[PDB]
Amino acid sequence: MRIDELVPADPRAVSLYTPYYSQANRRRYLPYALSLYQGSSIEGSRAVEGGAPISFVATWTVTPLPADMTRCHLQFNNDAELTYEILLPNHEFLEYLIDMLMGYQRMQKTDFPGAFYRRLLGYDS
Structure with a gap:
């Protein structure tokens, strides 16, 4: 399963597909x-x-x-006046995504962590 079986691999495609994130195998x-x-x-x-x-x-x-x-x-809350644009490097974005899924789905609450909100807000403390 690689990008060379899809569309021709651009240097951008190659670098995004390069990191193999794994917790075991x-x-x-x-x-x-x-x-x-x-x-x-x-x-x-x-x-x-x-x-x-x-x-x-x-x-x-x-x-x-x-x-x-x-x-x-x-x-x-689907409010267009409240739009968050969160973008992070492809190796850093998945760490954000796990925390996002874990915080709202696993805990079953609509309260984001303060340290997590620091990164979302973009406050360099």
Whole structure:
């Protein structure tokens, strides 16, 4: 399962697919992202238990080398005046994504951690 079986690998594609994130041997996150990379993209409403489902959009594509970041757009309570644009390097973005899924789905509460909100706000303390 590699990008050379899909579209011709650009240097951008090569660098985004280069990091193999794994906690043991194989990891379902890499091939799931390769499937999205084809142009399916991610857009939907993720259900946060204890509150309400908020729309989120994430797109993976060949972004320039110094800009090798994944961009996610999250609206708070589907309010367009409250839009968060959170983008991070492709090796750093998955760490954010696990914390996001873990905090809202696993704990079943709509309260974000203060240290997690520091990174979302973009406050360099």
